[PDB]
From a paper:
We solved the crystal structure of unassembled MCPyV VP1 pentamers at 2.1 Å resolution. The crystallized VP1 construct was truncated at the C-terminus to prevent VP1 assembly into capsids, and at the N-terminus to remove potentially disordered residues that inhibit crystallization. However, the construct contained the entire pentameric core of VP1. Similar truncations did not have an effect on the receptor binding properties of other polyomavirus VP1 proteins. With β-strands named alphabetically from the N-terminus, the two sheets consist of strands B, I, D, G, and C, H, E, F, respectively. The β-strands are linked by extensive loops that cover the top and sides of the pentamer. The apical loops, which make up the top surface of the pentamer and thus the outer surface of the virus, are the most variable parts among VP1 sequences from different polyomaviruses, creating unique interaction surfaces. The structure of MCPyV VP1 bound to the oligosaccharides is virtually identical to the unbound state, indicating that the carbohydrates dock into a preformed binding pocket.
The human Merkel cell polyomavirus (MCPyV or MCV) was discovered in 2008 and found to be clonally integrated into Merkel cell carcinomas (MCCs), establishing it as the first human oncovirus from the polyomavirus family. Polyomavirus infectious entry is initiated by the major capsid protein VP1, which attaches to cellular receptors to promote internalization and transport of the viral genome into the nucleus for replication. MCPyV VP1 is a symmetric ring-shaped homopentamer with the five VP1 monomers arranged around a central five-fold axis. Each monomer is composed of two antiparallel β-sheets, which together form a β-sandwich with jelly-roll topology.
Numbering used by the authors:
A (entry chain B): 41 to 112, 119 to 319
B (entry chain A), C (entry chain E): 40 to 112, 119 to 189, 193 to 319
D (entry chain D): 40 to 70, 73 to 112, 117 to 189, 193 to 319
E (entry chain C): 40 to 112, 117 to 319
The structure:
């Protein structure tokens, strides 16, 4: 039960973080494979059943838990507003990647474009996820083999046709950076009372990537009762995903690309019962 | 049905929650060996000769549910005042590696789900009123099966059914049985429902969709009165076609996503 | 005519409902011979030689009705204050399996109704004022029968009719008779009407349309006065071209949808 | 020029109506006049230099309106406070059967007027201040006969006229003489004008335009002051390029539409 | 650093006007042999082999100016506070030209493909240099090493080679936008983790022939006050103005393509503010 806002000196605090994209090649530090950090490997229809995608072809949600100043009818940190920005947008004007497919003979490269997916979330606990897939017959790498967490992971059995729709048993929590595939998991609207999430998709193969950036834009995190996400155990949960389109390679091969996201969250102290 | 004052008291407000799975043509996930295409149509392909005889698996239909509300009884009725609604599984559409997906060019990714979209929802205190109108009146719809204009008139369609025929009316009272291409919301009725919809045409038109748990639709009309649930029944209807799945052969199927609803209702005195 | 106060009394507000079927070129559903193409044009093609001599079936025209209002009679006039309007049958445009539909690629679905859109509606207390302007003044329109610039001028068009010629004026007083490609609302007149319209060109441009029974248009001008119905007549006009039907041969016909109106009117004193 | 109080009295408001026909290159209908409201064929040579013809240089429309004379160090001036403006003849663009139109494909309709759009209007109490900037400084425009950067400089352009050169300035004082591709509004001046404009580039980009007689633009600045009409002259300027006419041969010509204005003015004391 | 009251009395408000010409790669109009390409890049092309070694002329960069403000002046001082700006991309109308002699025709005998494709638009008003964050499409790109202070890239500020982490957010890859036409747009974006004393506003549009859609109007004002009602405060009596306005490609007959940019105009209103 939520009570009055705490009045006093150090009642407001400001938290900063950035999250690097987890597109498939999720580390910049690996000796050899890390050239493709912020990218997938080449995305291709197999041409025969079943699909058996590799983890490098499975862009995943970014998530971080931020520890907040210790507080203790108790006081909890309440997230009230956030400034967030996708970073490195200007990098996408580059149309002279050495192995870029040209728009036509002697032309510039096809710029990063096509499929976009953009979401962020701010919550006082992990984001609630609902599982739904394009094709239930997809064989995702097993979690026990080092793969991501998918619907088969949570069910403890194979997906059935119902997982192409909304199966209420196909649920999870976003508690692991770079391990929950975007194509498997979306925000669960039946839950997430203590989170605020905002997202969009854009399909098409060469659809223009259209993005804005400004340090003047603020998202208010209060619900219709004037209450923001309340941070359980002094943890603020921050999640996102920013697919910005394909890198088109000379051969015809295509890899998805992501960008990092920055957050500045304002929190206040709130009495709870 | 004269509307009196809003009821005051302890248990005067309730919230109703549900989800509706899409009824694209393959409507059940529980079938021997046809359910692999659940949430899809079969292949949509102009025959090249008349007449068109579309199969039921090629007719996306409206989803509908009647939610039973806590029994109440000048009487009290539940009044829907607002709704949070969301299209679920939007993220599933970043998949450009379906095993049998047509590629955008040699060695490239699959053409993503794109093209024709159609998105509507309705919240009402009775079944949504429907108006019949078809692209081609000479279309031979299967008999009962889906309910079409021929079904309701008990005679064949004539050219007037390419426009607005006042006799071509139905009530959306059955899940997965009223084809989208045949029926639309009747704006001449639906006093006790609220509906919101759009269409997008084109073959590879980008599917552009938003999702947020911060967005609320107010269901009150200009007199501050929401839909009043007759017989303690709330009717929820929707359709969400999100584009085509492009197969290697060149064939194409339409695809749909489920929709979630959270409706807030209050008690209302009525005479 | 001087506008006085709004009339007060029990029966001073009234509501008017109607629908207008589209007049695309084949304008009747009742012709045993040709009505299959009702709500469509015939095939649209450049002749390849001069001059263009378009047939009436290829000239979409404005829809119009005069609604008779209750007789009131310094006297009282009906004042249109708001309107709920909706394009009907939007959902029909998801059909991508018309038997003679041009496939998007080999073995694919049909090219959806798409391309050129033109959408307008008007509410007035007298016929809409029309201004004539054409793409090509050398066009030989069928004699009256559609009413064109030649009809009103009593002589051949000249180059000036490719721009604004103040002599090229008409009243929208007949359903299905004034070609959209010749006539547009006249902004220099129409003080007793409200009109709202748009165009979309391109050949395969997505048709993007919305429908809701919650959207109202306010018809009051900046002085709080709506159209006043001369002789107790309410004039409702519209046009809704929704794109091309792409046929297997390559041929293309423009298509239209009907429109619904619910207009609220109040009594007003005038001198 | 010190602005005092608004004049109050019986006859202190006036309305100015006018229309401006487009000046796309063929600027008169009273001759060649078949192509009035169009350019000639726009076509990169493939070799240098470009020496465009005047018929290929769409220009700004302008009119000075003589206002009722009003009149001391302190006198009355007309102040433009608002305007209704509308692009006329938008409906004419539904024509996809110009006799010489390039087809979208074999047997199909003509490619609709579409592609490059440029739309701007301006209301001022003096001529619109113009800034010169060209795509290519090596372009050799015709001598006076349109007014260009060379005309005002009295010498040939240099590379800097591809950017902002502060010497490349002019006033929009003559209808049909200032090329759009050479001149844009000068944001460093124009204190006594309001202007509003947009561009859209591309070859077949949909032309998307709206029209309504219910839309007003307020001309008051941040201090509640509209343009003040020096010597009782109101200056009205525009351009409305609506896309290409696509010809069978592959040749392409730009097309313009006229614009209507209704300007409301009030009397204002000035020192 | 503590903001007190707005100053009152005559002449507390001043206005600053300027324009910034674009720096697309060919940055001067005064070099007789190459200045024909002023406001354009050279031809943009994927090399076909590793590594990319891009030339300066192919690196559109930010425009920046530092405007000197009137002197005003102790613990309590007056500073200029930028409160609003009218800004406009100039020469938008020039883009209707589809008959450039070497313009690629849209189809046989047709008009030229108009300037279109990749747009990038941003402007900033600040009381100090804009803070930059470095991030590149490909970390293996070998940007030019020069001796004349430009182009400045990630390697320049690190004093060592980029690693894979420079395809993401590397907190060490930071700089200040302190020199006109020297900081490449494809390397640097505004740093949202700083810039407390600047306001910035920007967008991108990708695709190759995507319509260039721009507006212009002298009635458009951008308010520069933060949520506390405080605009950028000009330290050293210096107002920093930055922008970039890439408006698309020039499609040449050969198939070759160059990016093009337009200048930007600014009218900034400032007021005197007491500070501690
Ligand atoms: Cl998106
Ligand atoms: Cl839609
Ligand atoms: Cl339209
Ligand atoms: Cl435009
Ligand atoms: Cl942009």
């Amino acid at each position: 039960e939520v009570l009055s806002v705490v009045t006093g000196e150090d009642s407001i605090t400001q938290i900063e973080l950035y999250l690097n994209p987890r597109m498939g090649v999720n580390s910049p530090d690996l000796p050899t494979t890390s050239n493709w950090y912020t990218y997938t490997y080449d995305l291709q229809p197999k041409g025969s059943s079943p699909d058996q995608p590799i983890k490098e072809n499975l862009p995943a949600y970014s998530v971080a838990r931020v520890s907040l100043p210790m507080l203790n009818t108790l006081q909890m940190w309440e997230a009230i507003s956030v400034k967030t920005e996708v970073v490195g947008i200007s990098s996408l004007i580059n149309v002279h990647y050495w192995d870029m497919k040209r728009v036509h003979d002697y032309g510039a490269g096809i710029p990063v474009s096509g499929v976009n997916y953009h979401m962020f979330a701010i919550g006082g606990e992990p984001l609630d996820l609902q599982g739904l897939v394009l094709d239930y017959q997809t064989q995702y790498p097993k979690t026990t083999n080092g793969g991501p967490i998918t619907i088969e992971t949570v069910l403890g059995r194979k997906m059935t046709p119902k997982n192409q729709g909304l199966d209420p048993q196909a649920k999870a929590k976003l508690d692991k950076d770079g391990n929950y595939p975007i194509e498997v998991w979306c925000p669960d609207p039946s839950k997430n009372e203590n989170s605020r999430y905002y997202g969009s998709i854009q399909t098409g193969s060469q659809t223009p990537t259209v993005l804005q950036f400004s340090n003047t834009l603020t998202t208010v995190l209060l619900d219709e009762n004037g209450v923001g996400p309340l941070c359980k155990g002094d943890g603020l949960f921050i999640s996102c995903a920013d697919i910005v389109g394909f890198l088109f390679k000379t051969s015809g091969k295509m890899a998805l690309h992501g960008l990092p996201r920055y957050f500045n969250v304002t929190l206040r102290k709130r009495w709870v019962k």
